[PDB]
Amino acid sequence: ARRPARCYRYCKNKPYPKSRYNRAVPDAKIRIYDLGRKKATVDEFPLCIHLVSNELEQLSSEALEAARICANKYITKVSGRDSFHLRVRVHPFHVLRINKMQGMRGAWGKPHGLAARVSIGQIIMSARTKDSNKDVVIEGLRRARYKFPGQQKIIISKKWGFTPLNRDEYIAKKTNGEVIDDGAYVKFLSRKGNLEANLQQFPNYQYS
Amino acid sequence: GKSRGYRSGTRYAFQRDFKKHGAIPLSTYLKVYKVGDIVDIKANGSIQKGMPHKYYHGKTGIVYNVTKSSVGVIINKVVGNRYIEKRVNLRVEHVKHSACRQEFLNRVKSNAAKKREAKANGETVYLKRQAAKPRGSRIISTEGNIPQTLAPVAYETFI
Amino acid sequence: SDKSQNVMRELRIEKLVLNICVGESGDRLTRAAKVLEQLSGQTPVQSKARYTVRTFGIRRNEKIAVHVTVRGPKAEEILERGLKVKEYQLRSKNFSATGNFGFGIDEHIDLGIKYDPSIGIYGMDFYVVMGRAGARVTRRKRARSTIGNSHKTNKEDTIQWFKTRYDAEVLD
Amino acid sequence: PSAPSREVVKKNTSSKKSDAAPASADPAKAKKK
Amino acid sequence: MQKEFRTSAYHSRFQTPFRRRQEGKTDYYQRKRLVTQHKAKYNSPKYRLVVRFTNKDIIAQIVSAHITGDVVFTAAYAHELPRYGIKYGLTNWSAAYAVGLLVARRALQKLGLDETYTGVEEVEGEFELTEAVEDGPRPFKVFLDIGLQRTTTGARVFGVLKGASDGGLYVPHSPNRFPGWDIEAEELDAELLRKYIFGGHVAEYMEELLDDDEEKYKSIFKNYIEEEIESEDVEEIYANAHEAIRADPSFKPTEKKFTKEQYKAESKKYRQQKLTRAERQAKVAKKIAEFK
RNA sequence: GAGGUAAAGCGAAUGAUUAGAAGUCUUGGGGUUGAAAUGACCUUAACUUAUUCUCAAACUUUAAAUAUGUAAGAAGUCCUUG
RNA sequence: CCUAAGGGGGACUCAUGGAGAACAGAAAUCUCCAGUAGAACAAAAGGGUAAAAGUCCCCUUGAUUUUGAUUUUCAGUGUGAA
RNA sequence: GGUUGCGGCCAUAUCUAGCAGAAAGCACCGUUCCCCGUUCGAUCAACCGUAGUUAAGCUGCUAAGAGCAAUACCGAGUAGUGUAGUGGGAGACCAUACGCGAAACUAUUGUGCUGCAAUCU
Structure with a gap:
């Protein structure tokens, strides 16, 4: 049924999303993007590891599903289902077309599948875990790379978990009462807005 | 098939600016246009009468006629291998004075003003504009500004 | 200054609206209009259905309800007549967040008007719109604006004003 | 007597069932049973 | 349960109306129709008889519009x-007539x-326009x-209109808004005017x-x-005021008690x-300090 | 002067969309309270608030590079009056 | 397709949400508050429009006569339209 | 300097929540014979300026305020891009050379100016 992925590897066409102009589009294979202990707070998983695209390329949704399943299975089998949080950072929004399913007359294709367009340096999957669980997660992502076409790099992030702060400035902000939890993520105090609300929301804030 | 109507392809050009819809400020209706004046053509989407064609949106021309609520504007358009004389009737809402003359008109006054001063002083003065010349020699003092040595930095991943 | 005990901050009735929403048109609506003009002494107005609903049996642009607006001392007189029917006992869930209130009588003859058998009996909605001096600010044509927060009418202020004026009880 | 009628202020020209009128958007009026 | 409306995106995309429209003072539709001048009359200005009524005053100005x-x-x-x-009664219909007559006479005095x-030296209620003299x-x-303010037949604005029309100004108008005009019979009763x-x-x-009512008479009048x-002699007040206005239409400013x-x-x-930026900064610092 | 393409944006409008958090259920169901009170409870799902991941040829506040209109004087500018 | 859905003038503000009123309830009618247009403007889609170009009311036939110029398509011919 | 009438630019002017406002002005405010319009003198119309109030409107100030505006050893000379090579790479794409050069972000600052006429402790 599926053509080989080599037929849809390159970003040759303009983005073709679902809209009010194409409606007979089937759903993407990947439906879950957060796996593992997704409800864990920021502090339990300081280590972040990314799979990063070195290619301007298209990845099919079923390839994303296969890689997600492979990485999840390996990391769960080795270190347990609650030792990590894996997030897929690409969503398939681009509709691929197929023509045959006379000649080149009326050759406009029909929806065939979904793909995500990734750039060079774009993150495909991220995994936040404990430091002691580093070598496991890498090997989990190293296998997921086999489900993708092109070249991908495994990069250990300098930042704390999924936060945009480095591992040293997150500590600097937390020890000053400058950060609170909001479930799986955090909220940072801002020096702008209403003073009373900001002081109430961050009671442990040492003002300078 | 093909559609080539009057306002085809004018989706964004004839739009009002963001947070600038509504009624026209009346300084538009108070400006006085004379024959020979130079005006910038910019179609206003809220007034559909006297609206210019999409080609003339962004063109500058000569006012050749003044009517009750409009002015006649002269535009030169390339059609093939020569220019064709066009005469467009435009309501003053789509017409603004071009600022290119008021800059040049001041230079006419300044050149006249500077020439009479030199004549009154009996000297000669040069009024041609000059392009930016190469800069001349100069001495750089390092007192308080001793050079700092810079080097290319090592590669590092920041994600 | 902004003194609460100012002369112009006194609550008063702006208007009293009487509504009879008979679900059909024709004779019954005309008789309801006759009731309204007998009660208020001024010509009522008929309101058309905004859309067609099969469940209610109404069609768009069909004259369904009839209502009238009374102002001045006549509004006060009719309001106290209606409160006699309600025997001066309203609920806390009769006053809106904007300081107005209202109720509904089931029999219009209880107001003190002569019963007739051609006319029939019709229930009625009384609504009282409360307001202070300076509401014209929000209604005039030139320099129309809003009303300041302290001058606004609210639920609690209307509740205490009603309890003071009519010595009635507001079921909380 | 006079017969005045309330004038039109809304803009809904079509004679169709309006918004905010769905089934099952109501509570159970017979909850006490 | 319902979406909060006054969001920051609501204020960001809000286009405020014109300053004198948000004040609710200038009708820019009518202002555009009035001010705009025929483009072939290049710098010839249109003159507006702006008539405004307050609770205690009548203002009649002759105005020309400019970019500044x-x-x-x-x-x-x-x-x-x-x-x-x-x-007394400075906001009458007759007070409006006197104001219109005064502004017309003062304008013609300024022009020459x-x-x-x-x-119309003899006011008899006849409808009349100032024809040109050959x-x-x-x-x-x-x-x-x-x-x-609304156009109603018998309104005070058309009192100023009639006062200015009788004063020699050429103000185009029709008599179907003057008091004494019969809507059913399309003629103007000069006696009531x-x-x-x-x-x-x-x-x-x-x-x-x-x-x-003696008490209402005492209080109102x-x-x-x-x-x-x-x-009986009220009409003489206005009749003499008309003559005084026509004799001396000059403007006399009130002599100011202070400079x-x-x-x-x-x-x-x-x-x-x-407050200085330092002052509000100190206020914020003090609030932080008192919050422990 | 004009533009709305590249880029960018979505804790900015439209449309698409991942995940939790805290609240309202008073106009969601399930159960456990009651000899009955729709008045509490635990849960799923809905909304709301502050966040979060990813997007748009027929979305956009913003907005290039290149290309494009006009002007750079004697048929001009100024002074007086037919 | 439309004697108005054309023309002029005037008055008003829309979709929606919240809080209230006998029957009346998720949907009738009434009141207030909020409401940058999230409505409507015959018909596709785009643009435009808030004391209006939207809704309603009043009066009307300028949807009239004569013939020229101009714009678009363009040969700078016709037709249509403006 | 305050206020009013008519404005220009059309948020540095808007929005939310509080407080203050001498004089004048404005305003709310009182009445219904008349012109006039309404279901309703609420709006609109007229009369009085007399009976009252700054309660509101209006103006000004406050807010580690929302928005808006401006600036920058902010991001960032980054993204993008014109031109060039018998450059690299299987390709996708990338680097370099001569040029131009963002947006978001970050930080700081600010919160109407002004024209004509009249008037005022």
């Missing part, structure tokens, strides 16, 4: 009327068309501007109220009683000044 702002030609205020002999275009300058042409020109309605009200003005700088210094005492 409107420029006033002449102005007449109802409180100038006591100088001409009208002390006094002997020519004297106007081999002479055309009469001053001004267009009425009533702003946001003349009655409202010389304050007949107020005199009739005093006559009708004096013999019916307290000024007339304290000045010993009966209903401009004295007013400025006295007023500057009762104004709060903006």
Whole structure:
């Protein structure tokens, strides 16, 4: 049924999303993007590891599903289902077309599948875990790379978990009462807005 | 098939600016246009009468006629291998004075003003504009500004 | 200054609206209009259905309800007549967040008007719109604006004003 | 007597069932049973 | 349960109306129709007879519009009327007539068309427009501007209109809005217009109220009683004010008890000044400190 | 002067969309309270608030590079009056 | 397709949400508050429009006569339209 | 300097929540014979300026305020891009050379100016 992925590897066409102009589009294979202990707070998983695209390329949704399943299975089998949080950072929004399913007359294709367009340096999957669980997660992502076409790099992030702060400035902000939890993520105090609300929301804030 | 109507392809050009819809400020209706004046053509989407064609949106021309609520504007358009004389009737809402003359008109006054001063002083003065010349020699003092040595930095991943 | 005990901050009735929403048109609506003009002494107005609903049996642009607006001392007189029917006992869930209130009588003859058998009996909605001096600010044509927060009418202020004026009880 | 009628202020020209009128958007009026 | 409406995105995309539209003072549709001049009359200005009524005043200005702002030609205020002999009821229909007559005469005095275009010297309620005089300058042409206030037959704005029309100004108009106009029979009753020109309605009200409600008569017409003005000689007040206006249409400013700088210094005492950035910074620091 | 393409944006409008958090259920169901009170409870799902991941040829506040209109004087500018 | 859905003038503000009123309830009618247009403007889609170009009311036939010029398509011919 | 009338630019002017406002002005405010319009003198119309109030409107000030505006050893000379090579790479794409050069983000600052006429402790 599926053509080989080599037929849809390159970003040759303009983005073709679902809209009010194409409606007979089937759903993407990947439906879950957060796996593992997704409800864990920021502090339990300081280590972040990314799979990063070195290619301007298209990845099919079923390839994303296969890689997600492979990485999840390996990391769960080795270190347990609650030792990590894996997030897929690409969503398939681009509709691929197929023509045959006379000649080149009326050759406009029909929806065939979904793909995500990734750039060079774009993150495909991220995994936040404990430091002691580093070598496991890498090997989990190293296998997921086999489900993708092109070249991908495994990069250990300098930042704390999924936060945009480095591992040293997150500590600097937390020890000053400058950060609170909001479930799986955090909220940072801002020096702008209403003073009373900001002081109430961050009671442990040492003002300078 | 093909559609080539009057306002085809004018989706964004004839739009009002963001947070600038509504009624026209009346300084538009108070400006006085004379024959020979130079005006910038910019179609206003809220007034559909006297609206210019999409080609003339962004063109500058000569006012050749003044009517009750409009002015006649002269535009030169390339059609093939020569220019064709066009005469467009435009309501003053789509017409603004071009600022290119008021800059040049001041230079006419300044050149006249500077020439009479030199004549009154009996000297000669040069009024041609000059392009930016190469800069001349100069001495750089390092007192308080001793050079700092810079080097290319090592590669590092920041994600 | 902004003194609460100012002369112009006194609550008063702006208007009293009487509504009879008979679900059909024709004779019954005309008789309801006759009731309204007998009660208020001024010509009522008929309101058309905004859309067609099969469940209610109404069609768009069909004259369904009839209502009238009374102002001045006549509004006060009719309001106290209606409160006699309600025997001066309203609920806390009769006053809106904007300081107005209202109720509904089931029999219009209880107001003190002569019963007739051609006319029939019709229930009625009384609504009282409360307001202070300076509401014209929000209604005039030139320099129309809003009303300041302290001058606004609210639920609690209307509740205490009603309890003071009519010595009635507001079921909380 | 006079017969005045309330004038039109809304803009809904079509004679169709309006918004905010769905089934099952109501509570159970017979909850006490 | 319902979405909060006043979001930051709501304020970011909000397009505020014009300053004098948000004030609810200038109708820019009508202002565009009035101000805009035929482009072939290049710098010839259109003149507006701006007529505005307050609770205590009538303002009649002759205005020309410009890019930097409107420029006033002449102005007449109802409180100038006591100088001409009208002390009470400065917002009458007849007070409006006197204000219109005064502004028309003052404008023609400023222009220099006094002997020519004297106007309706004998006010008899007849509908009339100022025709041009042959081999002479055309009469001053001004267009009425009533702003946001409604067009009703018998309104006070058309009292100023009639006063200016009888004063020699050429203000195009129709008599179907003057009081005394019959809508069913398309003609104007000159008698009732003349009655409202010389304050007949107020005199009739005093006559009708004096013999019916003595207390309401005393309260409403307290000024007339304290000045010993009966209903019979009210018309003479306006008739003499007309002659006084036509004789001396000049403007006499009120002699100021204080100078401009004295007013400025006295007023500057009762104004709060903006806090320095350091002051509000110190306030924020003190609030943080007192919050432990 | 004009533009709305590249880029960018979505804790900015439209449309698409991942995940939790805290609240309202008073106009969601399930159960456990009651000899009945729709008045509490635990849960799923809905909304709301502050966040979060990813997008748009027929979305956009913003907005290039290149290309494009006009002007750079004697048929001009100024002074007086037919 | 439309004697108005054309023309002029005037008055008003829309979709929606919240809080209230006998029957009346998720949907009738009435009141207030909020409401940058999230409505409507015959018909596709785009643009435009808030004391209006939207809704309603009043009066009307300028949807009239004569013939020229101009714009678009363009040969700078016709037709249509403006 | 305050206020009013008519404005220009059309948020540095808007929005939310509080407080203050001498004089004048404005305003709310009182009445219904008359012109006039309404289901309703609420709006609109007229009369009085007389009986009252700054309660509101209006003006000004406050807010580690929302928005808006401006600036920058902010991001960032980054993204993008014109031109060039018998450059690299299987390709996708990338680097370099001569040029131009963002947006978001970050930080700081600010919160109407002004024209004509009249008027005022």
